[PDB]
Symmetry: C5
Amino acid sequence: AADRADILYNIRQTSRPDVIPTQRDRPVAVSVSLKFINILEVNEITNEVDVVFWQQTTWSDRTLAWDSSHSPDQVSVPISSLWVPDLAAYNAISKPEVLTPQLARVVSDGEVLYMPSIRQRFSCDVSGVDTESGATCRIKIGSWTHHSREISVDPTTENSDDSEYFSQYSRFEILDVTQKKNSVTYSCCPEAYEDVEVSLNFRKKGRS
Amino acid sequence: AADRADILYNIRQTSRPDVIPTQRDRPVAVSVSLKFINILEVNEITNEVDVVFWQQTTWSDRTLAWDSSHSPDQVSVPISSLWVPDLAAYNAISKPEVLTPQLARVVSDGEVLYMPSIRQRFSCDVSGVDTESGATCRIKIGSWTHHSREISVDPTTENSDDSEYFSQYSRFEILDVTQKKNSVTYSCCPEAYEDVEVSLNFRKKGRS
Amino acid sequence: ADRADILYNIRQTSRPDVIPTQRDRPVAVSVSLKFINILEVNEITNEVDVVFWQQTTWSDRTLAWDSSHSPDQVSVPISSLWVPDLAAYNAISKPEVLTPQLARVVSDGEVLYMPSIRQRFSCDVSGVDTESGATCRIKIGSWTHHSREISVDPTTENSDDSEYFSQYSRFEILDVTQKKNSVTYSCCPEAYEDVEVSLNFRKKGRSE
Amino acid sequence: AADRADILYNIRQTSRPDVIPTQRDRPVAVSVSLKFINILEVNEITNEVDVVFWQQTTWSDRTLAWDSSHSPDQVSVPISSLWVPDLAAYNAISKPEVLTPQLARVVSDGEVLYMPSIRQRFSCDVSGVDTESGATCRIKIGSWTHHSREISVDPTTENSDDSEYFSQYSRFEILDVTQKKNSVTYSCCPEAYEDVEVSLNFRKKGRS
Amino acid sequence: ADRADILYNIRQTSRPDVIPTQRDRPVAVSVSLKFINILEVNEITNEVDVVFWQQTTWSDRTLAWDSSHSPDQVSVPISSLWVPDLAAYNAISKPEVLTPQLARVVSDGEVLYMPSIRQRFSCDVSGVDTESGATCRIKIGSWTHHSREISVDPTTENSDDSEYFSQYSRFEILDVTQKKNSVTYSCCPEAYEDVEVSLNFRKKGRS
Ligand SMILES: CN/C(=N\[N+](=O)[O-])NCc1cnc(Cl)s1
Ligand SMILES: CN/C(=N\[N+](=O)[O-])NCc1cnc(Cl)s1
Ligand SMILES: CN/C(=N\[N+](=O)[O-])NCc1cnc(Cl)s1
Ligand SMILES: CN/C(=N\[N+](=O)[O-])NCc1cnc(Cl)s1
Ligand SMILES: CN/C(=N\[N+](=O)[O-])NCc1cnc(Cl)s1
């Protein structure tokens, strides 16, 4: 059929990175799930935390679909060639440091999977981080300019070990992670903006 | 009967990011409003503060207008495809750090709203920041190259809560925030440059 | 024509990489540093962090147009026009431009470019804690154009040395003097003109 | 006989930087080998180490091959004109800092070689760094978005000293370096991602 | 042919990614470090923060032009020209060019580039606090071009060492010797020429 070069060419032909792939007249269903990899530099005085994580992002874009009958059903494409959710962490106090090659996976049916590793600083509750019950830091992520009728965010509830990929060499340890969906409204505008809230319950590891 | 692809497309046909959309001979009306999200660093000796805020900027651009009678009346567009006010913080001692996706919301009537979240350090009065009455840090923001006749800056007076969006985990707290208007002239030229004096009356949270 | 046409023509004539040497002779570039602040200062290492507005002027005949029935001046991205390759010889960090990179172009070809710069220099910091104060020398000039291509001369004028100096700074400006110079180097036989700006300052609140 | 220009041009005309050089659906065999050069900023408390190494990377793309009969059999080419494996250090806690020109080396038989010098922080076991047995820091490097069916990583078990290129001025010393191979699956996909695991064994040089 | 014409020409015939090899002979590139300032230093970790002007010269005939009735020198952005792919072999931080990135091109095809660079190296600092001082040796050369493709010779132009060094620094230059050398590895049989810049300095006596 066609080769990976043909698939990419077609993409750049039918893709519109600056236009949201609004299916029918309904918002794009962007799924977000954070995989905590490390917890660095914590300050209980300034309520700040340096965190490394994998932002597993997904959504569909039918304008990139193709017939993978006798050709590959998946390819890696630079995000600059694709439309990407304008996600932002509300309580983030430093721009996200993308530590991995910014490539997205695209399936022939239009399913897009972007999972960059991210290091970033947040302003959250760090209190009790050294107590047995630990602290609970809450990360809010969601579109920055698209409201509920354009983009919906939902956490892909996939029963897994909160610290499955979490470093064993960190001074801290995850106790639990729960991801809830929310929808806030602002005075700037009459519409609401969906967002996912990830609650990181961690603490400093004791001693033998 | 046009979709978002048409809107963005048409926008790029009439948009002149490097040209100021001055209607006839009157200046461009820019509404500026800062929404303090956090106060990270504060130095009583050097009188410097590291702040985080949502700079709500507004202005109209008729050349971007379009009939939305049968299409979305709004779309998010990269600020690189639109002209944007050359606002600057006169007492900033560090370059602005935009923590959010650089997208603007453009309304079918040409209205433009850009609200980036910024972290920036300033030089201002920090004295009394540890007192009951707290400290008052004023931030002067305005066009850097367009004088009063070309660009005008007015605060988006919207009597709301000063700390409505302020972080609760900060070591400081907002006492009050007033945003007035100013018109200062300089040496370079006899033209007067308009600015907005945001007065952030804040103090260190005392409860220990 | 409108401002769109003025900026348009500037894109046709302007050669951002071709020095506007008018009829075989150097280009007259004036430079005036408007010290705004003095941040971190180390006497042990002799290094200082300084914020200032580098007021740069010069003429580019190629840009001149007819302001008979059109705006006399327009702001244009410095990337759309030739700009001096000024450099600070005793600079120890890249020049951090805190303001929008726009220059003021007058219909007669006169160009004004005044960015706010945050930089770290290597200079005599000793005596900063004394009455006479310390004097820091800033040598600025073209990095690749010699005396026959660029002539850098301080915009001498009975201006106020502390006119725009932050009142909230830990230091106070005692005196600012600007001496012009012309040095030759061990690479080329030609002479490179420079401008030395002496910044006399000291700590405030010292025991009298 | 063709010269370097002709050769480069040939590469640009056939090379697909955003397309993996797959040969009949078999995966691209990618070889990795880190030549540690220096170890800096070690922290046994937080288990973080800064490492400087030469990531020797090798793979093939026979579509770029040419007849070096009477013409150069090798040329340097900007990696932006070539397809480069999207390798990533899974345990890195800082984006890679490339300290050298980003040029590759293409050989007349389609073999491509890229060896950038990198400085990067990692989260690994550091306990024992000040002991005779030293510490063992395992670094995992492998394709970030291409699974084993698309890319395969294999450590060149070539004979060479461990601290051969290692700085003698480093506060540490390499006791031994062993490169293994892995293939992990993730909650995203059923396919596996091959990665080379380098185990560095070093200890604080004790001049006693 | 005025400057606009010159630049146009250069920018139109310059192949930034194609090494300008004259016939079969390698490209003769000259390297000269002019230490402008020695910042932070650490004898414990053997690391120094140096500032130096990297004088780099070479030729590219393809850029030549008759300067009889026109200028014989123009400033051109290095991004428009092919530039030697030098790298400090023992650098532990990427080079911070603090000056405009422009080269000087003479009508004969001669190219001169001297950026001011601040960079951190890993080298011998032991004795920096003594009368003898320390000798930090910096090796610079091509990264991908071997001896047959590129050659680096330190401009033997007898000049002063601390000539442009900063007087306000905390250290002082005792001596500097640019020695040409060669380097080979177990990857490739070919050798890569480089320049060893021996920096002999010590802390200035506090008094
Ligand atoms: C997600 N939070 C927002 N506002 N808020 O006040 O929080 N969104 C509205 C916009 C932000 N930037 C543009 Cl343009 S419209
Ligand atoms: C804010 N201070 C100014 N002048 N001043 O003399 O203080 N602004 C005018 C300009 C700044 N940059 C250009 Cl170009 S015109
Ligand atoms: C400031 N020191 C110079 N030479 N020197 O020998 O010290 N400048 C001349 C040049 C700098 N870059 C080019 Cl190209 S020509
Ligand atoms: C300067 N040291 C080199 N190798 N070495 O093993 O030390 N150079 C060869 C190459 C550098 N980058 C590519 Cl691609 S080939
Ligand atoms: C390293 N962890 C991964 N998945 N996971 O679910 O943990 N990697 C697979 C991918 C990474 N980026 C894209 Cl796109 S697919």
